């Protein structure tokens, strides 16, 4: 015996009363929702937050590091001979041992 | 697994035990398929049917895992060197490996002049 | 343009001398389509830089120099290390792309001359024998992740090096 | 006028706290004042504005 | 002619169609990205005198979008 | 900026009526992911702190951008499902959503690790309620109490491992403050110091060994398929192994060796087992195993070119595995049934989805650079510098990568379909956007992978 | 300090050090608040009442009581603070002995590989 067990039923919308629809009941709701403010994140989100990303707002020294670098190398280039690395951040240490 | 000989039509008789045999076949399997042909031949279902012998296939692997291994014997031992096992393999082959590379950063360098990447 | 070597100048200079034909298919393709989209493409470039007029010059490029090297202050302290750790890191991020300038010196060393390839230039190569052997020894390439105290460590160790080898000598 | 406030009143609350949350982390900076000109990296003698930028 | 092999298509198609809607809504930002390029200055390579470090945009170099 | 107007969610869903709800849950979510793109990612040459210290700034961490991605795809697919039921139960399991929202924002902002302990378990409470209730299967217990005596189990000893370091060596708290800390001289006693914050990542970032608790997370499913997306979130939300390694242990990497080893079985017999599998729910959950196991080998072996692979597969994974949840949840939402074998039919009844289903899957092998090749592959190059022999035993793996993909793919290619009757139409409008949203992201990142790996990129 | 030496023992607040000025419209007192507000909420879910937000009008009496004895309590969080740094310093200046000082080093540290 189940008594109230037995109440289990298979329900889908897919045409039926809906004519053609995402939200489950009303017209009016389903239009408004799954079509408009669904495809809103589609076109700020995703279209105008294309030009953000990493192009734009020079992200982390990428493009800042190139021009740097170049006055760096012609530079020592003209006075010094070595280039650039020879003793990284390293003048007059006081002994080791 | 293959024998000598390829099973197909290999070492058949007519006999009578085995022409009851075909018949015990036979009788489950219209039986099975009778309830099938009574769910698919109406417009009313509209869905996915059970079938009580494919939920059990997949309950064969899903479940079933601790009621099973109450006899853990010898077979149990040998499953556990082939998997605990192999991983103290690779712990005498990438040492040895490491030790060997280890070994030529302080004396006879063999690392290239061009390398910078890691 | 003056950072970038590169070689002086080409000749690239045609004969044509024998055979008649329809002079050449090469040559008379080049003045084709020099006129046709080419010199079209050219004067609404030039139509658009024209029409820019009004340009801001802008800073680019930002000083900020030494303020204490990481090798000079000691002992755990926010106040003095941050403008020392800031400093290397600096330093480690433009030569990334120092290297990538040396780099890019050997790139047009091998298209430019193509059947040489290693029977000329020389200058280029012995530049980044040099450079990639300091960068290894210097800016990490062995010791770990990034970091600015583990430096200092770093070049203590070659420091060493330079110090036993020399005395037995 | 009737038709707006009555519709809508929960939908104004989620853009007005994004301008609550940019009021609130924003003046977290005027608690911690310390290092503004001091400490050679980004200073810069003040010319016409006060204390360089907030 | 026959009736031939079908599918749903109209759930299908509309998807595509409802897509791309909101692509050429957002397509005219795209289409005044390339004039402000062709209309506005861009960027210029010269060296800084000691005046002023920072003014609306510190250090930006290409595209007035960036500024 | 990030915190406030995500708490100002839970009054919007319950004042609002009983009529709408999801409009407002929906189209809100949308407008604070879009600004959270707008302000974190801008960065120095070392990525400087946001304010006082509640929720700091971003180092390392695009990571952010995903959550805040999934904070709108969370609620899409969840649609079919609590739909049948009570009007003021669909208002508590989108507010446990939000409370989800609120605890994961503070976890990757928050550069600490003694406030950062308190909010690294406090996302399992909101699931634990999220799994435990609406699983249409049975054995929800059987993998409610495995989804946390496993993982409380492992970071329960962060409270005898974080304070014992902060009342000896200074004090935790920003990370930028963290230069105090000296190389540990290993010895026997600080074995269980390196151990105690390792088990606590071990659990939620799946291995070989003490892997059962994603599994059963994944096949009994808590909420249709968008629920799973957050489970998703919790094996990246175990990211503060990339903090700890680098910074509280530099010197010890030898007490790594054994843990390597470990991992890199945990990919043949992880993939393996991933073939011969009924659940089509199962056949990602196994395969999730082994991409997340990539990265754990990358932490180990603490190469600057192996984080860079180890950043973009925390990435990669996210949105490549929710992805293929999404399509199980299609399929469950139809068949009624999680079996591979049954459900059987693309193309001729799913036209359109099974383009999705193509590029869901290609996605997880090495395709042309759109996150993944940035980040598998990455790991592969910088384990080679570590040892010789790894690529032996990688390449291996990048064969059966295939047959997680192509096994889903072909077990479903077949245009049968005898027994099945339903699915009639092939998707909603809304099931259709929720394929596009996780792939054209992606897409995106092919231009600009900038934000997609960065530890000191 | 646990033990009182210089504290009056059984104090209403303090009053024996007023001296310290208590926070006026502070974070922390607001989130008392919420908690006074969030208690007048769940108590329409004990007895069944009409809307947890617009319900009953007692609901003022629960975000009073929440600030009162909160700014109490928040009262002392700041004077037993004070009074555990005020002991802290004072050990320092009358022994001397006990701490010490050390700046600037040249010291060597062991690198790791890989």
Not at chain 3, 98 to 105: A, F, K, W, Y
Not at chain 6, 337 to 355: H, K
């Amino acid at each position: 015996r189940w008594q109230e067990d037995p109440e289990p039923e298979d329900e889908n919308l897919y045409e039926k009363n809906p004519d053609s629809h995402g939200y489950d009941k009303d017209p009016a709701v389903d239009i408004w929702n799954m079509r408009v403010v669904f495809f809103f994140g589609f076109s700020i989100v995703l279209v105008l937050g294309s030009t953000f990303v990493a192009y734009l707002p020079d992200y982390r020294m990428q493009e800042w590091a190139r021009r740097e670098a170049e006055r760096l190398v012609k530079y020592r280039e003209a006075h010094g001979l070595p280039i650039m690395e020879s003793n990284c951040f390293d003048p007059s240490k006081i002994q080791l041992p | 697994x293959x024998x000598x000989x390829x099973x197909x039509x290999x070492x058949x008789x007519x006999x009578x035990x085995x022409x009851x045999x075909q018949a015990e076949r036979l009788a489950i399997r219209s039986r099975l398929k009778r309830e099938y042909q009574l769910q698919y031949y109406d417009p009313s279902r509209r869905g996915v049917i059970e079938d009580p012998a494919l939920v059990r296939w997949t309950y064969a692997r899903s479940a079933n895992i601790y009621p099973n291994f109450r006899p853990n014997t010898k077979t149990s031992l040998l499953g556990a060197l082939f998997g605990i096992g192999p991983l103290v393999f690779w712990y005498y082959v990438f040492k040895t490996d490491r030790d060997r590379k280890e070994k030529l950063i302080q004396e006879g360098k063999l690392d290239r002049t061009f390398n910078i990447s890691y | 343009x003056x950072x970038x070597x590169x070689x002086x100048x080409x000749x690239x200079x045609x004969x044509x001398x024998x055979x008649x034909x329809x002079x050449x298919x090469x040559x008379x393709x080049x003045x084709x389509x020099x006129x046709x989209x080419x010199x079209x493409x050219x004067x609404x470039x030039x139509x658009x830089x024209x029409x820019x007029x009004x340009x801001x010059x802008x800073x680019x490029x930002x000083x900020x120099x030494x303020x204490x090297x990481x090798x000079x202050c000691q002992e755990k302290d926010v106040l003095c290390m941050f403008e020392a750790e800031m400093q290397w890191r600096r330093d480690y991020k433009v030569d990334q792309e120092i290297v990538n300038i040396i780099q890019e010196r050997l790139k047009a060393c091998q298209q430019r001359e193509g059947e040489s390839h290693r029977q000329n230039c020389a200058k280029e190569l012995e530049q980044f024998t040099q450079v990639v052997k300091a960068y290894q020894d210097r800016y990490x390439x062995x010791x770990x992740x990034x970091x600015x105290x583990x430096x200092x460590x770093x070049x203590x160790x070659x420091x060493x090096x330079x110090x036993x080898x020399x005395x037995x000598x | 006028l009737l038709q707006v406030v009555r519709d809508h009143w929960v939908h104004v609350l989620v853009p007005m706290g994004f301008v609550f949350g940019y009021y609130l982390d924003r003046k977290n900076d005027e608690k911690l004042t310390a290092f503004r000109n001091k400490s050679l990296l980004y200073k810069r003698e003040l010319k016409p504005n006060e204390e360089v930028t907030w | 002619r026959l009736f031939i092999i079908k599918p749903s298509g109209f759930y299908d198609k509309r998807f595509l169609k409802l897509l791309r809607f909101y692509i050429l809504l957002t397509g005219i930002p795209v289409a005044i990205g390339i004039t402000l390029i062709n209309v506005x200055x861009x960027x210029x390579x010269x060296x800084x005198x000691x005046x002023x470090x920072x003014x609306x945009x510190x250090x930006x170099x290409x595209x007035x979008x960036x500024x | 900026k990030y915190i406030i107007p995500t708490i100002m969610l839970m009054p919007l869903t319950w004042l609002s009526k009983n009529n709408m709800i999801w409009v407002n849950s929906t189209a809100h979510s949308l407008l604070i992911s879009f600004t959270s793109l707008l302000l974190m990612n801008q960065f120095g040459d070392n990525s400087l702190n946001f304010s006082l210290l509640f929720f700091s700034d971003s180092l390392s961490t695009p990571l952010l951008i995903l959550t805040m991605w999934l904070l709108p795809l969370m609620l899409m697919a969840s649609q079919h499902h609590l739909s049948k039921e009570n009007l003021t139960r669909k208002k508590l399991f989108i507010t446990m959503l939000i409370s989800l929202q609120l605890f994961l924002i503070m976890t990757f902002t928050a550069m600490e690790l003694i406030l950062f302990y308190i909010l690294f378990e406090a996302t399992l409470v909101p699931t634990l309620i999220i799994i435990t209730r609406w699983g249409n299967q049975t054995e929800r217990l059987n993998a409610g109490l495995y989804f946390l005596f496993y993982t409380l189990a492992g970071s329960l000893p962060l409270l005898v491992a974080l304070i014992y370091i902060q009342n000896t060596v200074g004090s935790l708290n920003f990370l930028m403050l963290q230069y105090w800390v000296q190389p540990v001289h290993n010895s026997w006693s600080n074995v269980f110091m390196w151990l105690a914050c390792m088990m606590a990542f071990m659990v939620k970032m799946p291995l070989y060994g003490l892997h059962l608790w994603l599994p059963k997370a994944h096949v009994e499913a808590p909420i249709a398929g968008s629920m799973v997306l957050a489970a998703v979130l919790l094996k990246l939300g175990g990211y503060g192994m990339l903090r700890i390694t680098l910074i509280l242990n530099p010197m010890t990497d030898f007490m790594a060796y054994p843990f390597i080893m470990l991992s890199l079985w945990g990919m043949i017999m992880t993939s393996s087992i991933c073939l011969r599998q009924t659940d089509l729910k199962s056949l990602i959950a196994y395969s999730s195993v082994s991409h997340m196991a990539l990265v754990i080998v990358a932490i180990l072996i603490q190469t600057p070119w192996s984080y860079m692979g180890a950043t973009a597969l925390m990435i990669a994974h996210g949105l490549t595995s929710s992805m293929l949840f999404c399509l199980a949840n299609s399929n469950y939402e139809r068949i009624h049934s999680r079996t591979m074998i049954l459900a059987r039919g693309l193309q001729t009844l799913l036209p359109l989805m099974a383009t999705w289903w193509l590029l869901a899957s290609l996605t997880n092998l090495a395709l042309p650079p759109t996150i993944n090749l940035i980040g598998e592959l990455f790991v592969v190059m910088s384990t080679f510098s570590w040892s010789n022999i790894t690529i032996i035993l990688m390449g291996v793996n990048m064969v059966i990568t295939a047959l997680y993909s192509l096994y889903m793919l072909i077990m479903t290619q077949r245009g049968k379909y005898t027994y099945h009757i339903n699915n009639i139409s092939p998707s909603f409008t809304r099931e259709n956007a929720l394929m596009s949203l996780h792939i054209l992201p992606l897409l995106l990142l092919t231009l600009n992978p900038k934000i997609i790996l960065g530890p000191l990129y | 300090x646990x033990x009182x030496x210089x504290x009056x023992x059984x104090x209403x607040x303090x009053x024996x050090x007023x001296x310290x000025x208590x926070x006026x419209x502070x974070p922390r007192l607001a989130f008392v608040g919420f908690l006074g507000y969030c208690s007048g909420l769940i108590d329409n879910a004990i007895r069944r009442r009409p809307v947890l937000l617009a319900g009953l009008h007692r609901q003022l009496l629960y975000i009073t009581s929440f600030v009162f004895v909160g700014y109490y309590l928040l009262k002392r969080q700041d004077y037993m603070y004070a009074v555990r740094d005020h002991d802290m310093f004072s050990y320092i200046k009358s022994h001397x002995x006990x701490x010490x000082x050390x700046x600037x080093x040249x010291x060597x540290x062991x690198x790791x590989x890989x």
